Structure formats: structure tokens, C-alpha cells
Amino acid sequence: GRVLQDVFLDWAKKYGPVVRVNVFHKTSVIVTSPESVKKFLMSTKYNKDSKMYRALQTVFGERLFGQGLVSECNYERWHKQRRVIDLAFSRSSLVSLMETFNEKAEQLVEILEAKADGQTPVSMQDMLTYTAMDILAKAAFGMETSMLLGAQKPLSQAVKLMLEGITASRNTLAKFLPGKRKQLREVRESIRFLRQVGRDWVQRRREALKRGEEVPADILTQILKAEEGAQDDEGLLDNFVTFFIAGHETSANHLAFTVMELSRQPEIVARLQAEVDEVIGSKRYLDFEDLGRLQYLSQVLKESLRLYPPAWGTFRLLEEETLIDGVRVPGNTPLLFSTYVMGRMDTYFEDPLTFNPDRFGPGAPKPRFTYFPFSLGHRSCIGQQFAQMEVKVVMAKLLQRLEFRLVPGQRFGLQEQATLKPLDPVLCTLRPRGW
Numbered sequence: 001g002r003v004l005q006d007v008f009l010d011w012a013k014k015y016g017p018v019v020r021v022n023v024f025h026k027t028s029v030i031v032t033s034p035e036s037v038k039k040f041l042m043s044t045k046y047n048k049d050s051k052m053y054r055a056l057q058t059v060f061g062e063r064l065f066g067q068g069l070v071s072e073c074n075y076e077r078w079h080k081q082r083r084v085i086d087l088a089f090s091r092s093s094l095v096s097l098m099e100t101f102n103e104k105a106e107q108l109v110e111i112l113e114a115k116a117d118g119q120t121p122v123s124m125q126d127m128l129t130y131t132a133m134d135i136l137a138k139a140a141f142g143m144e145t146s147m148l149l150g151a152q153k154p155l156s157q158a159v160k161l162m163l164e165g166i167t168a169s170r171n172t173l174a175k176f177l178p179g180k181r182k183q184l185r186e187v188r189e190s191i192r193f194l195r196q197v198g199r200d201w202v203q204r205r206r207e208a209l210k211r212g213e214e215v216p217a218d219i220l221t222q223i224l225k226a227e228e229g230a231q232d233d234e235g236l237l238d239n240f241v242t243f244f245i246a247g248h249e250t251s252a253n254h255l256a257f258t259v260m261e262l263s264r265q266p267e268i269v270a271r272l273q274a275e276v277d278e279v280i281g282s283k284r285y286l287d288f289e290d291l292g293r294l295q296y297l298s299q300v301l302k303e304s305l306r307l308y309p310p311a312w313g314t315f316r317l318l319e320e321e322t323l324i325d326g327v328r329v330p331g332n333t334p335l336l337f338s339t340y341v342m343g344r345m346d347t348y349f350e351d352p353l354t355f356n357p358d359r360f361g362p363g364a365p366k367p368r369f370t371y372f373p374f375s376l377g378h379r380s381c382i383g384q385q386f387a388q389m390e391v392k393v394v395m396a397k398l399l400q401r402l403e404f405r406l407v408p409g410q411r412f413g414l415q416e417q418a419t420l421k422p423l424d425p426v427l428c429t430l431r432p433r434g435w
């Protein structure tokens with residue numbers, strides 16, 4: 001139930017705000033003082049370290065995220081893409097996605113209700129992954145993956161294998177073990193499979209447009225626009241993969257962690273249920289303004305990201321020798337900023353292991369540069385609002401309609417498969433609730 005990030009936490013607790021650690025077998029310095037987080041993340045003077053993002057660019061030799069929006073480290077090349085794709089994330093575009101978030105969240109609840117016999121185990125990690133994928137495929141690409149209907153198992157498996165491969169490739173000796181040759185081939189096959197799905201969905205979009213079919217603008221419209229000037233489609237496919245994975249798997253892990261922790265927090269669940277009952281009652285469709293009224297649910301989701309941030313770290317390149325909190329750090333060193341580590345430091349959060357949504361209550365002092373599950377600054381998550389809205393819609397509907405009980409034996413530990421996620425798949429038994 002322990003992960004590599006816990007060793008970084010141990011080194012930070014032992015040695016202070018600036019500590020040399022080994023990550024992806026490269027030397028890095030983890031920086032955990034709030035003033036240093038602010039200095040480096042809030043200035044465009046500091047950019048991502050390409051050496052650390054190579055683990056996403058290519059995996060076991062096969063191009064995966066390439067130079068898409070997450071893994072492009074050059075400021076100019078990144079900014080050019082960001083400006084174009086930001087258009088797909090305006091307040092108005094997001095509100096137009098509430099129909100999609102409601103539709104798939106209601107579909108999830110209806111499937112779960114059909115399974116809510118109080119004894120059959122349901123993997124909530126898998127069900128939330130299927131819901132997040134069906135939401136992203138429709139909202140971003142205008143496609144129906146229907147994973148909630150049991151379709152596209154090869155695609156869901158390919159995603160799982162490549163995320164495991166990201167972690168294996170950057171931390172293990174798999175590339176040299178004869179026993180792992182099959183595993184490496186299957187990771188490379190899964191990465192090529194996903195880029196070829198991108199080729200198909202891109203062709204479907206171009207053909208629909210060529211036939212004069214109506215096509216609302218979405219994320220795919222902007223990733224196509226960002227590549228207008230391109231020799232070929234590899235850059236476009238990098239952003240297809242980037243948004244296909246980032247736009248569903250991290251939200252799914254956040255939802256799974258929240259369901260896992262809430263299963264042992266009856267008092268908190270009672271308040272959430274009462275809040276949903278008072279705010280949305282038996283309404284079928286949640287409105288944008290409804291979400292803002294679910295104040296305690298927002299607190300709960302923020303506390304879930306403090307203790308269980310799926311995207312656990314970000315790196316900036318320190319180009320020249322610099323004194324950081326009194327420690328002289330050599331030039332060309334990757335600096336690691338980790339919301340996972342800071343969230344578990346008693347220096348920044350009293351009784352860090354206690355799950356207490358009141359840390360994010362009205363009037364509570366806001367964490368200052370000690371909490372950043374979507375990172376901060378210019379390279380912060382372009383999908384933050386998309387994610388916060390979709391997770392709230394799914395959680396509100398689950399709280400309205402179902403009661404969960406974790407299957408005895410399921411653990412509360414973590415595992416790393418690119419991002420952090422529950423070690424166990426959050427197997428639960430369900431019963432219908434309320435109206």
C-alpha cells in the first residue's frame with residue numbers, strides 16, 4: 001500500500017525543504033517549502049524539465065504522449081498549442097458539457113441500481129473508469145465508447161497496460177529481463193493500438209466535416225486547429241493520446257479514492273447525503289448552479305485530493321546554480337514539486353493522515369502553496385474545471401441514489417500506474433437509496 005512517493009516524503013521529512021532524491025533513476029531535488037513552490041511554479045521563467053517528461057513522451061521505445069500539451073517542455077511550442085486549445089475550455093463550452101456529464105452519470109447510476117443486491121461485488125474503480133472514459137470520448141471527441149455497456153474491453157485493457165508500462169519503464173529493469181519480453185511487447189502494442197484509434201477517430205471527424213455534417217466544436221476541433229500547420233499527423237496524435245488519457249484516467253482515480261475513503265467515514269457520508277437531499281432532492285438532471293450549492297461535497301473532494309492526489313508531482317528545470325532555502329542547488333537539476341508529499345507533512349497539515357473536510361471549510365485558512373492537485377501557474381491543468389464539474393456530477397448522483405459498503409478485505413493503500421490510484425479496486429456491495 002506504499003508507493004515510491006512515500007520514500008520521497010520520508011527524505012523530505014528527514015532532510016528538510018530541499019533534498020536530493022533518485023526519481024526515474026535520475027538525480028532530482030524535491031523542493032517542499034511554500035515560498036519555493038510559489039517562486040518556481042508561478043513564473044514563466046521556469047519551465048518543465050524535458051529529461052523527466054521523456055517517461056511520458058516515449059515508453060519502451062514507442063511514442064506515446066510525444067510533444068502534446070502535457071509533455072511539451074519548451075515554453076514557446078507549448079504556449080502556441082495552449083492558446084489554441086484553451087478555446088475548447090471556455091466557461092460556455094464547459095456548461096454545454098453538463099448534458100454529457102448528467103447523461104453518463106445517470107447511466108452509471110442506473111447500471112449500479114441493477115446490481116444493487118447488497119451482496120454482489122462491483123469494482124467501483126472499474127465502473128468509475130468506464131464512466132470517465134464514456135464522458136471524455138463523447139465530450140472531447142464526439143464518440144460513444146459505451147464502456148458502461150461492456151463495450152471496448154480491448155481499449156480499456158490497452159490503457160491499463162500502457163499506464164502500468166509508464167511506471168515499469170521508468171522504475172524497473174523490465175527492458176533487460178527475458179521474462180518480461182512479452183510484457184514489453186504488449187505495452188508497445190497497446191500504445192500503437194491507442195494511436196491507431198486516434199487515427200480512426202480523426203478520420204471520422206474529417207469525413208463528417210467533408211460531407212457537410214453538422215459537428216459542434218469540441219476539444220478535437222481545437223487539437224486539429226493547433227496542427228493546421230503540420231507535415232503529418234504525429235503531433236495531432238500526440239494530443240489525441242494526451243487528452244484521451246489525461247481526460248479520463250485521473251478523474252476516475254480521484255473518484256475511486258473518494259468512494260474508497262468515504263466507505264470508512266459514515267459521519268461524513270451522512271452529511272453529504274443530507275446535503276444532496278436538501279439541494280437537489282430527487283432531481284434527475286443537475287444544473288450548473290446546483291453543483292455550486294453542494295458546498296460540503298466540494299470540501300470532501302478537495303480533502304480527497306490533499307491525501308490522494310492522482311497526479312503526484314511536477315518538475316521544473318533549474319538552469320543555473322541557485323540558493324533554495326539556503327541550500328545551493330547545482331544548475332541543470334530537475335526540481336520536483338509534490339502535492340502528495342506536502343499534503344502528508346505535519347509541518348503543513350496538522351494530523352496529516354486524518355481525513356477532515358473541514359480543512360476546506362468557510363473561514364478555514366486556505367492552504368498557501370502547500371496544496372496543488374492540479375498544479376499551479378502557467379502549466380496548471382487545462383482540464384481542472386472540466387474535472388471538478390464531472391466529478392461533482394457523478395458523486396452527487398451516486399450520493400442521491402445508492403448506498404455503498406466496501407467488501408471486507410479491500411485495502412486503503414495506494415499503487416502507482418503512471419498516476420496514483422487505490423491499490424485494491426474498490427470492490428463494493430450496493431443498495432438503492434432514497435427516492
Ligand code: HEM
Pocket residue numbers: 069070082242243246247248250251254309310311312313314315372373374375378379380381382383384386387
Ligand atoms: C481530477 C482530475 C485531474 C487532476 C488531478 C489533474 C491534474 C493535473 C496536473 C497536476 C497537471 C500538471 C501536470 C504536470 O505538470 O506534469 C495537469 C495538466 C494537464 N491536465 Fe489535468 N488533471 C485532471 C483532469 C484533467 C482532465 C479531465 C483533462 C482533460 C480534459 C486534463 C488535461 C490536462 C492537460 C492537457 C494538462 C497539461 C496542461 C498544460 O501544460 O498546458 N486534466 N493536470
Ligand SMILES: S=C(NC1CCCCC1)N1CCC(c2cnc[nH]2)CC1
Pocket residue numbers: 052053055056070166245246247250311313314315381383418419
Ligand atoms: S505520470 C504523469 N506525470 C509524471 C511523469 C512525467 C513527470 C511528472 C510526473 N502524468 C502527467 C500528468 C497527467 C495528467 C494531467 N491531467 C490529468 N492527468 C497524468 C500522467
